[PDB]
Structure formats: C-alpha cells, structure tokens
Design a protein around this ligand. Sequence first.
Ligand code: F43
Ligand code: TP7
Ligand code: TP7
Ligand code: COM
Ligand code: MG
Ligand code: MG
Ligand code: MG
Ligand code: MG
Ligand code: MG
Ligand code: ZN
Lengths: 548, 246, 442, 442
Amino acid sequence: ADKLFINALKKKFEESPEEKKTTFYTLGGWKQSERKTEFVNAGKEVAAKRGIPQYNPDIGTPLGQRVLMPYQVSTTDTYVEGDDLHFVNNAAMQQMWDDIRRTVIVGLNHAHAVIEKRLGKEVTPETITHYLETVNHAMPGAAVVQEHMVETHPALVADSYVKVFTGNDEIADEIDPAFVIDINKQFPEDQAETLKAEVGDGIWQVVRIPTIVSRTCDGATTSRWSAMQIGMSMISAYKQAAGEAATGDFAYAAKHAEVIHMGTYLPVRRARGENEPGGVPFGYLADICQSSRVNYEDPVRVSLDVVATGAMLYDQIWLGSYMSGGVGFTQYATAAYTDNILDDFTYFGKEYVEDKYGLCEAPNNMDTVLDVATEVTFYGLEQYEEYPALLEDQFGGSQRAAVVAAAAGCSTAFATGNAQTGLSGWYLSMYLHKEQHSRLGFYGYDLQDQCGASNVFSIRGDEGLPLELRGPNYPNYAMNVGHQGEYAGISQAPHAARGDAFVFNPLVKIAFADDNLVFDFTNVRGEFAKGALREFEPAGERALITPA
Amino acid sequence: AQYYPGTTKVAQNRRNFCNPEYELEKLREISDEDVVKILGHRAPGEEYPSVHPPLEEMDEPEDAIREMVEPIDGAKAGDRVRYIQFTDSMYFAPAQPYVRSRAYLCRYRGADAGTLSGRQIIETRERDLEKISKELLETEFFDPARSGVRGKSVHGHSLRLDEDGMMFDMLRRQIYNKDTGRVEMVKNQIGDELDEPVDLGEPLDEETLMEKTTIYRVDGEAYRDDVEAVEIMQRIHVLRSQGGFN
Amino acid sequence: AKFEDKVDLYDDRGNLVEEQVPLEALSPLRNPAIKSIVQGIKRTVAVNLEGIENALKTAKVGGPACKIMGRELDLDIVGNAESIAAAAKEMIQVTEDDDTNVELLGGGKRALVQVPSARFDVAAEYSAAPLVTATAFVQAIINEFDVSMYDANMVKAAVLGRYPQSVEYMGANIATMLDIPQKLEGPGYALRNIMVNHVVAATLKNTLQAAALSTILEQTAMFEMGDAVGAFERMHLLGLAYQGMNADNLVFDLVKANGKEGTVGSVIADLVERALEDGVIKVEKELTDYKVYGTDDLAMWNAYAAAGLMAATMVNQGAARAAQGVSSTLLYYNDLIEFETGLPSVDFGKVEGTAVGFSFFSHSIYGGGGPGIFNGNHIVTRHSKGFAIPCVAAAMALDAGTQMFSPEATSGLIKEVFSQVDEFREPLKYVVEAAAEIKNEI
Amino acid sequence: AKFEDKVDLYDDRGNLVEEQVPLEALSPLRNPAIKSIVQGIKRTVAVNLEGIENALKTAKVGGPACKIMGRELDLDIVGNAESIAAAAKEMIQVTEDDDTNVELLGGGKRALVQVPSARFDVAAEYSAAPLVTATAFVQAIINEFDVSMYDANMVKAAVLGRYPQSVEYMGANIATMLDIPQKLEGPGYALRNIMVNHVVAATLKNTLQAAALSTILEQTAMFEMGDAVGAFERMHLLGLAYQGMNADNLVFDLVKANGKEGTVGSVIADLVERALEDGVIKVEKELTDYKVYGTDDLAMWNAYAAAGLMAATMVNQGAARAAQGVSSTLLYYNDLIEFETGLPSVDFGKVEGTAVGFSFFSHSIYGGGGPGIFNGNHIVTRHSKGFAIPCVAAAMALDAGTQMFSPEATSGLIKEVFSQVDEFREPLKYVVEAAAEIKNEI
Ligand code: F43
Ligand SMILES: C[C@@H](OP(=O)(O)O)[C@H](NC(=O)CCCCCCS)C(=O)O
Ligand SMILES: C[C@@H](OP(=O)(O)O)[C@H](NC(=O)CCCCCCS)C(=O)O
Ligand SMILES: O=S(=O)(O)CCS
Ligand SMILES: [Mg+2]
Ligand SMILES: [Mg+2]
Ligand SMILES: [Mg+2]
Ligand SMILES: [Mg+2]
Ligand SMILES: [Mg+2]
Ligand SMILES: [Zn+2]
C-alpha cells in the first residue's frame, strides 16, 4: 500500500512527492493563508480598539515565501494549518492539560482505618455511597455544615466530581454505580484482571477539581482542594464533631499519606508545585493516555497515541510556554502527530521486528539495539531522501531527529520488551543520523543525546533510572524540545507489545478511564483535530457570569 | 591525524575539509571590500570598532598560560567578536553543518563554531573573521546555488531547489540570473541591500557537486554502505554505554 | 565562660550526677556529646535490605503503587546480606578501621550504616550519608549477583526511588532522620526537619530521653540559624538546660509534685512559687488583690517557665496517656501564666502562638495531623525557637496508643536502626557525662 | 594505597615540585589542603559595610529598586568599622583563640569574615556562615549607635535583605561563594553552585589557579554526591589530577606546544600521540587507512583526554582572549577526538552533551548567558561530573574584556574578600604541597 504519508504530501504540494524542484515567492506571502488573513484582520481590529499596535504582517520578515502547509492530524482525515494546532488556539489541547492538572488520586484505605479504629464506626458499601453523595455535593465548592456559607455556582463547576474504584468486584458493585469507575466495563478482560489484582481490596478516589479553579490557580491547588472537601464530607457523612483531633488524620491521609499527584514538585530554578507538567513522569503520561485499553490489538497505535499526548503537553505547553513562551513550539510537536509520518516509520520497524524476531522475542541486549535501531533509522532517513516533499514538510532537523529516533526506539522496545534498550536505540539513532546528514537538530538538541548512551544504563545517583520513572525533571532532559513526548512513547512501546495493562502506575491508568472527563483520553489525536476545527467544548468558561 | 573513517568520496571529502594540509580548492575571486560588505558588520573604510582596549595597553599580571598562547591579531587589537553563518542544502552542497564546525576547529584559531540543522556559524575577532571569511567564500566550502550566507531567516537546507537549482531564501540574498548563469550576492548576510552586487561565480554542475559533497544520501553514496564509518559510530555508542555503567 | 551561671545535673531517674557545672558545658558549641550526636545524625542511614529485595522481585519501584511489569528481578539479597554489607562497607569507608559502621539487624533484613565522619568534614552538608550509602549498596548488590548492564538500573530504583525525576528519594528503601536540603523552610533548619515520631522511636519512648533528644536537636539548630548568637545565646542555653536537660531537677520535681492529682494550673502555681523562692521573679507593684511580678533576668524567668511548660505537658498528657492535648497545654500554660503573673510567657508569646496554630492544625480539615508528624521545620511548628517541639516529643512518648500515625506506623525502620545507637537513645546520659567531664575547661 | 598510580606535581610555572606522589594524596578525602579549602569556603563571608550604610541612609532595602520612604537612617558605620567589627567578632567566635577571622578591607568599607570551623562541625550544613555573620553585624551596628527598637529592623533589612519573605537573602549586603541549600538541583550539589566568575575573581584570573580551584570544588562535590564512590573513584581522582592539578605537566606541555599557532585539532593530535607514547592507548584494529584505538585503562584514557580538553580550551579561548568559544571547544574537542580514535570522549560523551546545551544557552534567546554565570549546579552545565566547568573557569580567566557579565560586574565583593585568602587564591600551590607532605601516609 502507499507509504502512510503520501496522501498528506499530495494534499500539501502541487508537485508529486518525489519531485526535486519547485517554485517559490509567487504565493503572495501571508495572503495565501486563510488563517494568516484572519490574523491580519484581527490584529487591525485589536490594535484599533485598544490603541496599541499588535499583530502586523509587515513587522520583521514576510511569512509564506514558500507554501504554508496544511497538516493532516495522524489517524484522522482532518487537515488544518499549523496555527490551529497551537495550544493557545486549540481548546482541546488546553482542556487535556486542565483535566490532568485538576485530577488527584486519593486513597480511602487509611481513611476507612481511621473511621473503624479511631472513631469506632463501621464502613460498608452503604456508608461509602452516602459519603460519595455528600462529597459530590461538597467537592465543586458547596457547604455541608455551617450556617451562612456562600458557595460556587454549580454550573461553573459542573466538571468537578469524585468517583471511586476497587479491585474487589463485589464491593465495587455494591457502591452506587454513578460513582464507580467500573474496571470490567472499561478494560478488556485480561487487562481488567491485571488491574484488579494490582488494586486488590484497596479503595481509591479519583477527584477532579473545577477547571475554572485550576486555571485561576495552579496544579498544587488540586490535592489541597480535594482534601478540604473530603474532610468536610467525612465530618458530615460519618457524624464527627466538626473539628476534633481525629479530623487531622483525614487531612494528613488525603494530603500526604494516601495521595497520588500527577506530577511531583520541581527544583527552584524551574520552581513549580505539584501537578505541573514537568513533574509528570513518562510512565504516568503513558498511563494517562487511554489508547492502551481501546487499541490494544495494535501496539503501534497505542505507542503513538502516547507520543501525541506527550509531544503536545511536554513540548507545546510545558517547554513551549511554562518554560519559554511566545510563538513557541507547535511544529516541534506536530512532527510527531501529523501526516502519518511517525506512523509510517514505526509500522515499518514493528513489521521488521515481527519478521526477524517476533514481538518481545529478541534478546534484551546491545546486539538487538544495534540491529533494530540502525535498520529503522536508515529506513526513516531514506524516506526524507526519496521524497523531497517529505523533507520540506519536516523541515527542521530536530523534528526529523525526534521522529526517526522515536520509530527506532519504539521498534527496539517492541523487539526486547524492555524500555531501557528502547532508550539505547533512541540515542544510537541520533548518532547515526548526525553522521549520515552531517546535522541533527537545533543548536542545543543533543545535550541529552550525547550524554544519552552513557546514562541509559548508569546506576549513579542523578543518572540511573529506568525510563518509565524518568520525566521532564530527569537532569539531562530538563530543557529541550523533541524528546519528552517521544520518551513517553518508548516507555509505552514494550508494554503495548507485551499486552500489559499499564506502564508504571495502575491507579493512574484506571483514573483516566472515565467518560466524565471533558477531554476523551482514548482518542488524543482525534481530540486534537476536533479542537483544531474549533469544535471542542472546554470547561471553565466565565460566560454565565459575564455580560451577554 | 586521521579525522574520519570510511571509504567513500563523502568520507574522504570530510577528512579533506578537516585537514589543514589539504589545500581547499579555490573556485572564485572576491575582493576584500566585497567580503566586508557581505559580512555587514562595518562600512568600507570604517575603523574596526573595539570592545576593550588593546592587550598592550592592559598591563596584566604574570600568567604562564597567557604567556604561552599567542593572541590572534584581532585579540591584540581589542576587536569586536563578529560572525559569519552559512546554510547548506541537503541536495549535495559541498560543506555541511558538522563538517564545517569540525573543520573550523582543526583549521582556525580562536574560533567559536556552532552547528545546527539549518545554519552553521563561526564567531571570532573581527579582522581575523574577515580573513577566514574570504577563504569560506572563495573555496569549495561554498557553492553559490546550494550554500547561502545568512545571519537570519535561514530556512532552506531541507527545501526543494527552485527551477534554477538555487536553494530557497526567504530574503533572496543570492540571485541567479536566468540569461547569464552567474550568481550575485544582492544583499549582505542579514538581508540589507548592497549598493552594488557581488559576483559569486557559477553554480557547480551536478557532477562536480557529487565529487565534492559531504552529505550521504541514497541517491549519492548512502551512509549505510560506508560500513567502516557505521562501524565506528556503533563502536562509540557501545563504548560510551559500557563506560557509563561500570 | 562568657556567662556566670552554673547548673546542677541529674540523671533520668532524678538523682544528682554533678553539681554546679558551668552552663556552657551544655552548649552545642562545646559539649563533645552533642557534637557526636549531631555528627551521628548527619552520618547514619537505615538500609532496608528486605524492602530492596521485595521491590526488585515485584518491580514495585518509584513510589506508592508504582510497578514496571516485566522488570522483576529475583535476587537473594537478605540470604547474602553479610557479603553485600561487607562489600558496601569497603566502598563507604575512607580507610580501613576508620569510624565507618555497617551492622546487620533483623537477621540481615536491615542494616545500620554510619558513613565515616571524614566524608562530612570535606562536604558542604549531610546528603553524602544517603548518597554514599545508596550507591555502595547498589554496586555491592550488582556485584554480588553479577546483575547485567541491562537490569542494574532496577537495583538503583529499588534503593533510591524516583530520584532524580522527583526531588526526594521517592520510594527509596533507605531512611535517615534528616530530610533533603531543599525541604528546609530556611537556611540553618536541617536539624529541625526531624519528625517527632522519629525522636520518640529512637529513644524507645523514654519521656525524659525523648525531650532531651528533641531539645538538643532544636537548640543546636538555633545555633546554626544564628538565633543563639549574641544577645540571645544565654536564653537559648538556659532553655536547653532547664527544659531539655532537667537542670536542677526542676522538671522532674514539678512532675513529682503534680503527677498524682495535678493539672496545668497546679504546675503553673508550683513554678511561680519556685521562681519567687529562688529570686528569679519578685513582686514589682500591688494592684487591687493582685500582685504584679517583675524579673531582673528575663532569660532565667523564660527558662524556669519553660521547665514548668515541659512538666505541665508531662502532667496533662501523662494523665491522659494521649498526646493530642499537648497543643492545648502549650497554649494555656502560657496564656494562664501571663495573667497569673504579669510576666511574658515562654519565648515571649511564640510558644503560645505556635500552640494556637498547632491546636488548629491537629483538630481541623486544613493540614497538619497528629502530634507525632510535626517537627521544628513544619510550617505550623517552626515559630518558637526550640521551646515547643520537645514538649510534643514528651507527649508522644507518653501516648499509650491513641494515634493512627504513631511512631510504630511512621518510624519503624528508623526505630530499628537509630535506637541501636546509645548516644541517640539515651542522650541525657551522654550529654550530662560529657558536660561533667569538661566542667573545668569552660 | 587502594590505587597504585603515582603522579608528578608541578607549580603554575611548569616547574616540578614533587615526583611520584600517590594518586590518593590528591583525594579530597585525604588531602588536608582540599579539606581547609572546602571548610574555608563553607565558613567565609564578605560583608559590605559601605553597602549596609548606604542602604540604610537611603532606605533602599529588600531588593532591586525597593525603598521605604520615611525609614532612612544615617549611621557612621564605615567610620566606626573597627569597633563594629571587633564587637561582631566577639559574637562570631566560639572562644578567644579559635580560628575566627574578622579583617577590615578597603578602609573599613568591607570585612573578610571566617566563622569558626567548629560551628560547622556541630551544624548540618553551611548556612551558619551567612546567618551567624549577619546577626553579629546587625547586633554590632545596633549596639554601636544605640539604634532603637523601632528602627533596628531596618538594619536587619540592610544586612540580610527580604529574607524570610524571599527564600534567598534578596537585597543582602553580605556575600558568599556558596548559595542557599534550597537552590541545589540535587542533594550533594552545594559545592557545585559556585559561579564561575566567583572562582575567576578569587584566583585573580590566573588561568591555572582558576582551573585548579574549579576542579577541586567540582570533584570534591563528586565525592559528596557519591559519584566518586566505588567503581568510579579512580576515574574522578585521575580527572582531578590531570585536568585540574596539571599532573605530569600534561596540560602545561600541551599548551606550550600549541600556543603559538595551535588549534583544538592540533592539541587533539598531540594528545593522541602522547597517550600512544605512554601506553595509555594502542591500535586495536586496522580499517581501510584508519587505525581503531583501544585502551585497557578507560579511567586513564579519560584523564589524558580531559587534560587535552583543558589545553584545547586554553589554546582556543586563549588565542581569542574571548571566553565564549569554550562551549564550542568543549563540544568539538570531544566530537573530533572520538572520530579521530574510535574511543569515547571525556566523561563518555557527557562533556560533549553538556557543551551542546551550554553552546545553545550561551548563544540563544532561551536562558543561560555568558560563560561566567554558569556553574556546576546550573541546569545547563550540571551533566558532566566535573570535567566541563573547570574549562569554563580557565576560559573566563583568559577573557580580555568581551563579556558584559564579567567577574568585575558580578563578583567584585567576592573578589575583594575571597582573593585575600591564600588557599583560595593559589590552591594549586597548597594542594600540591599538602599532597607531597602526606605522600608516605597513603
Ligand atoms: C532566533 C533563533 C535563535 C533562538 O534562540 N531561537 C530562534 C528563533 C525562535 C522563535 C522564532 C519566532 C520568530 O520568528 O519570531 C521561536 C518560535 C520561539 C519563540 N520565541 O516563540 C522558535 N525559534 Ni527556532 N524554531 C523552530 C526551528 C528552528 C530551526 C529552523 C531550521 C529551518 O531550516 O527552518 C533552527 C535551528 C536549526 O537550524 O536546527 C531555528 C533557529 C532559531 N530559532 C533562530 C532563528 C533561525 C533563523 O534565523 O531563521 N529554529 C525548527 O527546526 C522547527 C520548529 C521551529 C519552532 C516553531 C514551532 O515549533 O512551530 C521555532 C521555535
Ligand atoms: C499547614 C500546611 O499543610 P500540611 O500540614 O503541609 O498538610 C499548609 N496548609 C496551610 O497552610 C493551609 C492554609 C489555609 C487554610 C487555613 C487558613 S486559616 C500546606 O498545605 O502546605
Ligand atoms: C536554562 C534555564 O534558564 P536560565 O538559565 O535559568 O535563565 C531554564 N530554561 C530552559 O530550560 C528553557 C527550556 C525551553 C526553551 C528551550 C527548549 S530547547 C529556566 O528558565 O529555568
Ligand atoms: O537556533 S537555536 O538552536 O538556538 C533555537 C532553535 S528553536
Ligand atoms: Mg538490508
Ligand atoms: Mg466522550
Ligand atoms: Mg584576492
Ligand atoms: Mg530532690
Ligand atoms: Mg597502515
Ligand atoms: Zn493557572
């Protein structure tokens, strides 16, 4: 069948994708683009209303001396200009991050122990349901004990709620099913049995605070807001004194002893509290993405859905705004989720490994890394050489480096069933690419790349970590675009090839298996395309409280 | 010195750019004035601006390292550090980004070289930069169709050539003339119009590009068939991997 | 000596050990036993070899509920504890037969490790203890079993957790009484970020030894913070001696007098009487049926009032055998004594303010928890400069089982290793013996 | 001795000082001069008495552009410096004949303070230096002028800034080479958070001495981090000796041979020839007109390549007298040497990778700055384990005035005070003397 990027390349350019020559300078600059024309008109309108110049297409250099391309969102049939994939212009991308930032997982294990042992009251499915009715009134910001409380408007905070899950089916089925993430409904049988075995008789809350609060405030608000309203609801539902010594054990349990943040806090140069993107380890990002429970027949699809999740969050929002800003890093990330390019390379490598070894049947060693990563690197690079339209599409070397090395590292991990050798294959890919074309990425692209080989298997204090546990705060990774979302894909790759239900935390995997989320984590690239088309409906808006 | 493994023309060309004993082929003559104009840092007859006073005016303490290391002439004078930056087409330009930084640090003294996919730069003291720049412009480091002198707006290394065989340039600093076949530099490297254009000679024909290129490609010499060069890359990978462990 | 004061030193049974020892013999800057306790707490690490082995066999590494399917390694680390420990000790030590200690406990399930003090005299801080310990155990595990390059990173994760993606050693199977330098509320706070339950576990819930260890650590931090420099130094030393060291047997004797039937208020009445008997306070003015007391020695009044405050905690929380009310004792001993006398309460109101927030954050939804999880670096309990936390330590030592987050719950690894060390366990014995030994050199 | 290696040690003029010194005599764990340097940098504070006086007179306290109208206090601090310094010293010292130093400079406008070592042996970390110094000078200034209770908090703000509202001493008029413990990227990093410009200023831009001080601090941090424990120890000691201590005169002799007309590439050719001549590498395999080199001692190959890298920086940035190209030298020295030889570059690629990001963050819009503002704790330059930042120090020592953020701009207070201290200013001298002294104890 044609390579998977050919339809996109025929949509973008009039020439055939193999054609080496074109014409430039004849498209009228920005005037060729619907979106730039919208921007030029909006800038005139903004500047005139506010009395300060703003967007002006004649500032600096004239965009569109070449074709300003559409991009196909991979796995979709939606083609949009890249400005529609900028996170500022894409409400689905903003809501994806809000839905992670505003979530926290909070055990009821220590809490129920405090109730039984310290207050001397019984817990059963019935008392749990009554506590859940109470906390779903209180969590969005409404009162249960005091007189003369003033409360949040329920429609502004409609996205905030609490659900629970447990690995004990008979206990799950006794709690009111309005509040339950049903593992058996959400996961195919084998993954459901794995997840339930991990959870056991433990009972956990998934708490989502309001998007309007998360946007007002920060990620470190989430576990606090969660615990306040858990605390009020434990007072009201189990009939405590409203503020006695035992109250503080529910606070410590919900805020510290049985909380699981999405992200850990950051060191001072990049100071941030919990539940910010830099704290989210790669294994958690693969677990947040829900492609694993829907597309499990196709480990390439699962892995590259995780790459899309991560390239957007880690390069566009985190590195391209929290850690920099401006125009930012849209196409550094779009290279990994558009035009079916990474998909073409990664299916090639998956089939190569199937034919030579069998998925997960290769020895977990450097021989396998050298064989698979080299073969897949050369395939990817040959496509840019055979198709000048493909090279002009992924015009920055960093974009190519990330795409070729993601396909090489995911394919190596499909062979070995182990993410560490996948990561060695990523670095070998960069070294071969650099020598093949006498270039790689931007000035600073390969800081982690050159430290890379030596730190894959190191065991030293700030060097040695399995890839699943690394994240944007692993020292070598803390700065640069074109790596973090691809590493989350490599962390997913061996687990999707093995059919594992999760990559690093089963509670995080379950916690996003929930259609009450605003963003649909089962189809990240589909949602990105919906947002690009201005068809996604986010939470958090102030329309109800502002002039009509 | 050996410089680079491999048995292709690409490999030998990578070694020749690094080797200061290899005489770079001169392809074109450019006047001193025109190198100055293309750099764009100062006007013809303008004295070299200074960033600090001449070394002899500074009366420094005894330092055995400084006493052993001879300063380049622009450092003795206190010249500004300025730059020259080139973009090389992936369609078989003779030099390429890492080839340039590796070569510059073997050939040139007092050099700050930077490599990127779409641009490669050297920064050094201004009067010394003008002497190196003549060599980068006059020799087979440069082709006037497939290489561009560009301080900003560098896009084009990865683009399709136009119908004349010229790399894309958002700011059209180098113009091929359809009737004559020569390229002229019509703007300096930052994109400002030159009073008079600089002739940069004829684009190298396809055969000569293939003789002189340092990029590996499936339609030229493929890197994967230069098995000795791949062996050394793989060796480096494996030795760094084992050494980081134990 | 800079100061003229002398104190009489007693043992933990209330028996005299040494008379008329100069106050500065108890100073953290002079007493060699306080130096060896602080250096020991810098350098001591608890290694949970059974936890490492279990994390490896299950691939449960990197923090709560985390697991990597397919990464399990089944290594017989506890069965080979002696060899692993010896190989780690050879990397930990600087020279053979220096002060490095590596001792197995619980049939090889745990190791007490004391990294050589010389590594700290060439270090900025104290992180060499967990870092040098973790790497020596990671390498000795890998070398014991010939763990491959491909798998060794799981040994690392099972030892030290998610570091460096997380700032802390999240999920580590090693433990220290100190916590990482980034978590200090201010420079100089490291000896304050020691959980009260750790102090009570290491002293085996001996009430006077838990109070002494906590006061040592708190008042030693007040030197490192600069608070006990210059004008304030004597106030801090007299607090150490009278509230933490049982100087003059004053905490002991107030507890003896009030333990059978006493309250916080009966202890206040006894301490005001004893301060007037000893000339620490005097009647300054008579109002209508009320005497206004004054003092010519605010540091000494503070110290007597601090001894009373400790005795009142031991009476009130000892009577309940329930630690929670320590927050109330710390508040109302100070509030009551100010309206009883007209003189300022302990730490000039800062114990009372610490107690207001501590009471709130141990009885509310907003944060905190039970007494045992506080420490001098906790935002709720940092505000008094050493005079509050040791009372919390005494109250948790007296708690007979009312807490969920007890020292048995939070501090079991710490207990098994740190209580081995005689000077951490019974620091009142060793600090008093060292003060008597140096008495004529101060 | 754990290691059999011996090295010859030279002074900064290339003359032999001592032959055949055991490697561990240079270890931070054994060498007494490295101990005195590290305890010195923990305990030494620069006090800007003029800056305190000016901040008070204008009420400009609390950080850039901040001022409190109506709070101005005009105190003759510099004219009474001798008295103020003596009173601060009495509070700083532990005893009258200890190693506290308080010395006025600049006619009383500045003071060098060295807080007594013993305060640190009973401290967790190093913040007692600024905190004990700050309060002793705040108290001494208050007591010199009898500043009232209502005004004294302005003296505190002028000395220590906006702390504790800010985490740092924001607006302080004291300075140290270390920075606060909360700013460490990881535990064990404090000796790495020392600006390159502070090292170059303390050593008066003597290139070899700047490279030595930087190396001593970086490799001593490697011990505190646990990196130099076990398998890696010899690699770190040999890097210290050859890259920072000019062992065997290797750096010196490379620079001598390449200084007149040399490049990074000529220094590589000479180092490869010297490694071959010394037996550190040998030809393993012949490819087509290409010799593949091997080694049976990767730590020694790494060290020789590290000495070459320092020489290449001296040649390259010495010829330009401009530091910026150190990021390029650190990159392409390592990239060229691997394709020249078939062996891994310094620190197995981690100098090269540090240099890629350092080059980017010294020539782009995103962060970083000029070479002198980096340090081993900086996110851009932390990745190599001691083998990159000393080259940056050498390059800034050789810079003739191309930097806006030069040591004169960022480190003038540091320079005046810390270059007074002989062991900080000329550490190559003292560490080599101490190594020769303990030669027979290893
Ligand atoms: C000024 C810099 C230096 C710097 O610190 N950042 C710049 C510019 C910055 C700006 C450019 C916005 C603008 O035009 O005003 C932004 C968008 C960051 C921001 N401030 O919002 C950016 N780069 Ni850059 N930058 C990019 C890239 C690149 C590629 C472009 C090569 C080419 O041939 O076109 C090269 C590096 C390389 O050669 O590998 C590059 C250089 C550069 N990058 C050169 C300018 C190059 C030029 O003069 O043309 N970027 C890329 O390779 C692709 C992604 C792209 C980013 C925007 C997006 O992700 O959508 C953008 C990311
Ligand atoms: C004490 C501390 O909580 P922890 O004991 O760390 O759980 C802290 N909260 C607070 O200070 C709550 C302040 C606002 C609520 C009470 C206002 S009176 C915090 O979350 O960091
Ligand atoms: C280096 C550091 O900047 P400073 O040197 O501290 O100014 C850091 N920025 C970054 O890492 C930029 C990362 C994203 C922009 C570059 C992506 S390649 C930060 O702001 O904390
Ligand atoms: O040109 S740079 O590599 O510095 C920045 C790329 S976005
Ligand atoms: Mg083949
Ligand atoms: Mg839906
Ligand atoms: Mg000429
Ligand atoms: Mg008696
Ligand atoms: Mg031969
Ligand atoms: Zn926000």
